[PDB]
Amino acid sequence: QLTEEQIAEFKEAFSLFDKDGDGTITTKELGTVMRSLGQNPTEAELQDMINEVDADGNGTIDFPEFLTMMARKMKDSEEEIREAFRVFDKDGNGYISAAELRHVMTNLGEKLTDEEVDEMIREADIDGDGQVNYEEFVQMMT
Template structure:
């Protein structure tokens, strides 16, 4: 987003058209647009199941094609076969039941905890953080991971993981 018109996204959507009942700051919309752009690497204007699989593979995660299709299908309000920016923002701003959030966080944690030990390697989390924010420097990523691993053990338990994700 350029600074001359913060109410318009690069793909032509206007900020005021994106906020439903939730008012979004220009900064938050920029964050959503950056995340969306990472998934929409070919600038198609939508994210399809193959994009979800590609991002998962880049993060050393396994995501089956049918799982990616279910994810996209559950968010594809206009049944276009992909998730556009408006649908993505809708997903990102939908209120979540606290029990559902905890379950989602546990599932996400288990994705990283490949050996089922109850901890994840701080370096794996750092690689994932760098994937999602490609402009993050190595030092910034190290700082973030040190916040997620306050005891400097090199591994992160579920509670540290949740605190890390919800700190913003």
């Protein structure tokens, strides 16, 4: 089921959202992350999102709720995946390179060794060309 390495990855991803590290993700923090990813949600849109994952309805997202949400890997939109792919593939060539992934990690404020970026690319790469194309990007989250 949910591996322990996934719980490790999701706990790290959670720290990327929870800027102050107070253990909760707020609309403000969700707003800065989304804007760092080239998005631009409104206060209400941001609040709507927290709601779609705020199990106890307290307004903020805790790791349990975030882990729960991630658990919903059972999902799989070709325009929702498409926008995600686009934030990574900055030069728009159809391939996410290690350098592009690094750039998004940077905007997200995550420090990773080149080896670590190669590894992430590695686990998503299927054909072995050392890059991630749309087809491999999709499978990476469905």
